[PDB]
Amino acid sequence: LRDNIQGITKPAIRRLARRGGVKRISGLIYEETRGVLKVFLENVIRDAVTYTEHAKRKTVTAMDVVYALKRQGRTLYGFGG
Amino acid sequence: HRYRPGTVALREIRRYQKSTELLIRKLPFQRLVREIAQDFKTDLRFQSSAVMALQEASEAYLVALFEDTNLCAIHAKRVTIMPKDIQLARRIRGER
Amino acid sequence: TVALREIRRYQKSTELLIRKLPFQRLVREIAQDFKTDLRFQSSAVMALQEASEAYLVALFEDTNLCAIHAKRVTIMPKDIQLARRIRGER
Amino acid sequence: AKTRSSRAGLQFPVGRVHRLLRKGNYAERVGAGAPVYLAAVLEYLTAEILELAGNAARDNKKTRIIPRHLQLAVRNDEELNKLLGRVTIAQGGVLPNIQSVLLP
Amino acid sequence: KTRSSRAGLQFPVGRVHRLLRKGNYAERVGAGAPVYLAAVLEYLTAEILELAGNAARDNKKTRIIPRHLQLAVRNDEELNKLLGRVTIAQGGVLPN
Amino acid sequence: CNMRTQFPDLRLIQYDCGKLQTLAVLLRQLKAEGHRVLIFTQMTRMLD
Amino acid sequence: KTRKESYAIYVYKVLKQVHPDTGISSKAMSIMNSFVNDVFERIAGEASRLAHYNKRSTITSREIQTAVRLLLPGELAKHAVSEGTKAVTKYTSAK
Amino acid sequence: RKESYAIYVYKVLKQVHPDTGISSKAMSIMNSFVNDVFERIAGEASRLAHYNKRSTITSREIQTAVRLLLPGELAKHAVSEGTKAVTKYTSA
Amino acid sequence: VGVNLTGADTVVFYDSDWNPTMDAQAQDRCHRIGQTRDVHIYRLISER
DNA sequence: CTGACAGCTGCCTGGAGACTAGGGAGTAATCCCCTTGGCGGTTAAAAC
DNA sequence: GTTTTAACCGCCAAGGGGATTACTCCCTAGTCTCCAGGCAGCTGTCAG
C-alpha cells in the first residue's frame, strides 16, 4: 500500500464540488482537496485507532469511528450510538 | 450540437444535489484508509461499517468545504474556485 | 503611516479598547429584556467585556483576511457577512 | 401494576430513562420527576422532527421516512438546524441551493 | 508518608483522587489513575510555566503576567492547538 | 567486455530447479520422437 | 443473541401519534435512535454539570428544565418546557 | 475554605524557574487551565470506561484519554511521564 | 473454449491445479475431436 | 504607595489499618467469516 | 469524442484468527475508624 492518495479521483472531486454548488473548477483544486482529505482522514483514523487499541482489540469497529468523529466535533448519525 | 459552457455544470449540480449516494468508489477509499492506518499501527482490521462511516463523514466534510469555497469564489467577483479560495475557507474555519 | 503605528500600539498593549461604562450600559440594557431588576457582579461585566473584545478582534481579523482575498484594503460589510457565514455562526 | 409512562401520559419509557440516568454516572441520586421530564422532552423533540420528516415524505410522494427526508426536515427548520448544526446524517445529501450569480 | 511524595510528583495525587471519586466519572477509581493524571497535569504545568518564564525573560521581567502566558501559548504550536478555543483575560494577541 | 562485466550462465537456470532438468530431458526426447508439446503453468513469472 | 435496548418501539409510537399513515426505514430508525441518544446525553450531561455547580447531589426536574432551556433554541425550548411541566404535573396528580 | 492549584503551580515554577515569580492574575489563569485540562481528561476517561463497559477508572483509561486529547509531542511526553510516575508509585 | 490446438500431441503440466476440471479443460484443448494422434499427458511433481 | 512572599494559626482531610464483596482477570470453546498471493475476464468510470 | 484501465468479480486453496458467551476465582477497590500533617488564610514585611 503506497501512493494511494491518487485513488481520490479528479471526477470524484468534481462531483463533490458540484454537490457543493461549485460551477467552475480550477486545475489546481484537486491537489489541495487531496491534501485536505488526507489530513482529515489521518486525524479521524488516529483517534479511531486509539479507541480500538484501548479496547484491547485489533478490529476497528464502526462504533470507534463514531466516537472519534464525536470527539472531533463531527457527530455522525446512522452508524450506532 | 454542443451545450454552452456552464449549462452541463449546473445540470450535474442539480443531479448530484438531488441524490444522496456516495460519490467516491468504495475500494479506493478502503485502500487509502488502510494505507493511512498502517502508519499508526500494523495489523489493524477494518469492519465494513467503519469504512462506510469514514466515507460518509469524509464526503460530508468535503461537500461543506466545497460550499464554503464556492462562497469564497463568489466573493471577489469570480466563478472559478482556486486553491486560494480553499485556503481562505479553511483559515476562516479555524483549521491549520 | 499612522494606521500602522496605531496597529502596533494597540497590538503591543493589553488594556480593554472599549470604554467600560458604555459596555456596561449595553449589557444591562440587553439583560433587561431577559429578566427584570437583574444585578451583575463587576467581575461578570469584566468577563463579558473581555469575551466581547476577543470575539470582535477575531472577527475583524477574519474580515481583513476576506478583504485581502478580494484584493481590497478597506473592509466592507460583505466581508463581515462572509466571515460569519464561513465560520458558521450565521 | 401501572407503568410510569402510562401515569405521566407519555410514550417514552420513564423507567428506562431512570435506569439510564442512574447507570450513566450523572449524580449520586436521581429525582422522581427527572425521568418523567426527560421522557416528555425527548418525546416532544421526536414528535417535531418526525412531523417535519413526514411532511417531507408526503411532499416526496413517499410513505416511509428515509434519511433524506430527515435531513431535509432538519435543514429546512431553522431551530432544528441550529440544534443539529454539527451533526451529519448518513445518506442525507444536501439541500438544493444554487447561487444566483451562477444562474444564466 | 505522602502519596504524592511516594509517587515522586508535586501535584496532589490525594486531591486528584478525591476529585475523581466525588466527581461522577465512574463508580470505581483505581490506585494508579490519580497518579497518572497528576503526572500528566504536572508535565503540562511545567511545560507551560517554562515557556511563560522564557517569554518573561525575553521581556526583561521577573514575574509571569498573563501576557507572558498568552505569548507562550500562542508561540508553541502544540499548546496553541490544545488551547485553540480558549481566551485569556488581559492576554492580548500575538504581534502581527 | 568479458573482463568488464560477468553475467550468470543461462545453464544455471536449469541447474537451480530439478523440474527444469527433467523438463529439458523430456522435451529433447519428445522432439527426437517428433512430437509437439504444450506446457501449462499457473504462474506467468514461471512462463517468463 | 443478547438484549440490545433501543428506542425503536417508542419512536414508532410517537410517529403513529403524529402521522398514523407514514412509516420509517431501518436506517432512518437508527438515525432517530442516535438522535434520541445524543439529546439524552446532552441533557444528562448539562444536568449533571448544573447539579455539580450548585453543589447538589441529585438530578431533579429543575435541573433538566434548565438543561433544556440552555440547549434548545427559543420556541423549541419553550414548547419543550411546556410539555415537560405538563407531564410532571400529570405524574404528580396520578401519584 | 477554597481549594486551588496555586501552591502546586508555584512549586512547579520554582522547580523549573527558581528566580521567576508569577502574578495573581497569571496564577488564576494557571488554575483555570489546570481545572480545564483535568476536566477534559477525566470526561474522556469516563466516556472511555462507559464505552468499554468497565466500572473502574484505571491508569489505562487516563493514558488513552491523554493520547486522545493532547497533541503529538505533548501526548508522548505526558505518556512517558505518567508511566514513569506509575512505575515509581508501584515500586514502593 | 475457442482454441483449437489439435496440431499438438503432448501436454506437460508444469504444476497441477487444485481443480481437476481445469486440467481436464487444458487437456481437452488438444484432445478434442478432429485430432489424429495419440495424446500423452506428463505431470511433474516435486518429492516431499 | 502596593502586590507578592512568608511565619504562624486553626482546621479539615488524607494517611495508615481491617474485612471483604465483587469487578475484573484466567480458561475454555463456538462459531463466523473471512484472508490473501497469484491467476483470468469485462465493461464503465477514468484519462487524454 | 476517442482510448485506458481498474473496480470487481470469480477461482483456488487451508486453515486462522478472535469476537462472543459462559464458567470459575481472587486481588483490589469500598466502607469504616482514628489521628496527625497539608493547607486556606491572616497580616507583617519588603522590593518595585
CATH at residue A4: 1.10.20.10
H64 chain-A contacts, CB cut-off 8 A: 50-51, 53-54
* Nearest CA distance, D2 vs chain A (angstrom): 30
Question: From the CA of H22, how many Å to the C1' of K42?
Answer: 21
Question: From the CA of H7, how many Å to the C1' of K38?
Answer: 11
Pull the grid cell for residue E54: 522564557
Cβ pair D81, D74 in contact under 8 A:
yes
Tell which residue, F17, B57, E2, E60, has the closest CA to residue A43.
B57
DSSP characters over chain B: --PPTTHHHHHHHHHHHH-----S-HHHHHHHHHHHHHHH-SS-EE-HHHHHHHHHHHHHHHHHHHHHHHHHHHTTT-SEE-HHHHHHHHHHHT--
Q: Using a 7 Å CB cut-off, which residues contact strand J?
A: A 6, 9-12; B 25, 45, 48; E 1-4, 6, 12-15, 17-18, 28, 63; F 42-46; H 1, 10, 21-25, 54-56
Interface test with E, best of H57, H69, H86, H91 (most E CBs within 10 A): H57
Q: Which helix (H) or strand (E) holds G58?
A: strand G58-59
Q: Which domains does chain H have, with CATH numbers?
A: 1-92 (1.10.20.10)
Contacts of H7 (CB under 8 A, 6+ apart): none
Question: From the CA of F6, how many Å to the C1' of J45?
Answer: 49
Cβ pair E68, H26 in contact under 8 A:
yes
Pull the grid cell for residue B11: 445540470
- Which residue's entry shows cell 484491547? A56
- Which residue's entry shows cell 495424446? I39
Q: What is the DSSP code (8-state) at residue F8?
A: P
Q: What is the DSSP code (8-state) at residue A7?
A: G
Cβ pair G68, D42 in contact under 8 A:
no
Question: From the CA of B49, how many Å to the C1' of K1?
Answer: 40
Is it the case that chain A and chain D have 3 or more CB pairs lying under 8 Å apart?
yes
- Considering Cα of F39, then F40, then F45, then F46, what sign does the dihedral take? negative
- Domain range for D66: 1-104
Tell which residue, F14, B33, H32, E3, has the closest CA to residue A64.
B33
Pull the grid cell for residue D46: 421526536
Distance CA E88, CA E76 (A): 15
Tell which residue, A77, G3, G76, G10, has the closest CA to residue D17.
G10
Tell which residue, E46, E48, E29, E13, has the closest CA to residue H88.
E13
What is the chain C residue with the closest CA to E67?
C14
Distance CA D21, CA D15 (A): 10
Cβ pair G64, G47 in contact under 8 A:
yes
How many pairs of residues across E and G have Cβ atoms under 8 Å apart?
A: 3
What pairs with residue E28 in β-bridges?
Answer: H56
Per DSSP, the three-state class of A40 is helix
Q: Which of residues 46-75 of A touch D (CB under 8 A)?
A: 69, 73-75
Q: What type of residue sits at position C37? A: D
- H18-37 in b/e form (b: 16+ CB < 10 A) is eebbbbebbbebbbebbeeb
Q: Phi/psi at B3 (nearest 5 deg)?
A: -70, 140
For strand K, the positions having any atom within 7 A of a protein Cβ are 6-8, 11-13, 17-22, 28-30, 37-41, 48
What pairs with residue D20 in β-bridges?
Answer: none
Contacts of G41 (CB under 8 A, 6+ apart): none
Tell which residue, A71, H74, B90, C15, has the closest CA to residue E73.
H74
* Nearest CA distance, B21 vs chain D (angstrom): 7
Q: Phi/psi at D32 (nearest 5 deg)?
A: -70, -40
Q: Phi/psi at D90 (nearest 5 deg)?
A: -65, 135
Tell which residue, A50, E54, E39, has the closest CA to residue H90.
E39
Is it the case that chain B and chain G have 3 or more CB pairs lying under 8 Å apart?
no
CB contact (8 A) between residue A50 and residue H64 = yes
> Which technique was the structure solved with, according to the deposited record?
cryo-EM
- Which residue's entry shows cell 527426437? F32
Count of alpha carbons within 13 Å of H31, Cβ hemisphere only?
A: 14
Per DSSP, the three-state class of F38 is strand
Per DSSP, the three-state class of D29 is strand
- Which is it for strands G23-24 and D29-30: parallel, antiparallel or unpaired? unpaired
- Name the protein residue, with chain letter, whose CA is nearest the C1' of K1: B2
Tell which residue, A13, A14, A72, C67, has the closest CA to residue B88.
C67
**What is the experimental resolution, given in Å to one decimal place?**
3.9
What subunits make at least 3 CB pairs under 8 angstroms with A?
B, D, G, H
Is the CB of C61 inside 8 Å of chain B's CB atoms?
no
Distance CA A59, CA B47 (A): 7
Q: Which helix (H) or strand (E) holds E64?
A: strand E63-64
Crossing angle of helices A29-54 and A10-19, rounded to 10°: 90
Q: Which helix (H) or strand (E) holds A42?
A: helix A29-54
Q: Phi/psi at E56 (nearest 5 deg)?
A: -65, -40
Q: What is the DSSP code (8-state) at residue D88?
A: E
* Minimum CA–C1' distance nucleotide for F41: J39
- F34-43 in b/e form (b: 16+ CB < 10 A) is ebebbebeee
Interface test with A, best of H64, H69, H76, H79 (most A CBs within 10 A): H64
Contacts of A59 (CB under 8 A, 6+ apart): A52, B44, B45, B46, B47
Distance CA I48, CA I38 (A): 32
Cβ pair A70, D83 in contact under 8 A:
no
* Nearest CA distance, A70 vs chain D (angstrom): 9
Of the candidates B71, B85, B92, the beta carbon closest to that of C65 is on: B92
Contacts of C43 (CB under 8 A, 6+ apart): none
- Domain range for A74: 1-79
CB contact (8 A) between residue E96 and residue C11 = yes
CATH number at C53 reads: 1.10.20.10
Q: Which helix (H) or strand (E) holds G23?
A: strand G23-24
Distance CA D53, CA C61 (A): 40
Cβ pair E59, E68 in contact under 8 A:
yes
* Nearest CA distance, A25 vs chain B (angstrom): 5
Interrupted after residues, chain D (C–N over 2.5 Å)? none
- Domain range for B90: 1-96
Cβ pair E39, H86 in contact under 8 A:
yes
Note every long-range contact of E27-34, with CB atoms under 8 Å and residues 24 or more positions apart, other chains counting: E27/D25, E27/H55, E27/H56, E28/H55, E28/H56, E28/H57, E29/H56, E29/H57, E30/H56, E30/H57, E30/H58, E30/H59, E31/H89, E32/H58, E32/H59, E32/H86, E32/H89, E32/H90, E33/H45, E33/H57, E33/H58, E33/H59, E33/H61, E33/H62
Q: What is the DSSP code (8-state) at residue D24?
A: T
Q: How many CB atoms lie within 10 A of CB E20?
A: 22
Cβ pair H64, A71 in contact under 8 A:
no
Pull the grid cell for residue E48: 507551560
Crossing angle of helices B48-74 and B26-40, rounded to 10°: 100
Cβ pair D24, G74 in contact under 8 A:
no
G37 chain-A contacts, CB cut-off 8 A: 81
What's the distance, CA D6 to chain centroid? Answer: 21
Q: How far is CA A11 from CA A7, A57, B5, B27, G53, in A?
A: 11, 37, 17, 16, 53
Distance CA C62, CA C57 (A): 9
CB contact (8 A) between residue B20 and residue D92 = yes
Distance CA G12, CA G33 (A): 11
Distance CA H67, CA H64 (A): 5
* Minimum CA–C1' distance nucleotide for E17: J14
Question: From the CA of G68, how many Å to the C1' of J35?
Answer: 50
What subunits make at least 3 CB pairs under 8 angstroms with F?
I
Q: How many CB atoms lie within 10 A of CB G3?
A: 5
Per DSSP, the three-state class of A25 is strand
CATH number at E90 reads: 1.10.20.10
What pairs with residue B80 in β-bridges?
Answer: A24
Q: Phi/psi at E83 (nearest 5 deg)?
A: -110, 40
Q: What type of residue sits at position B25? A: R
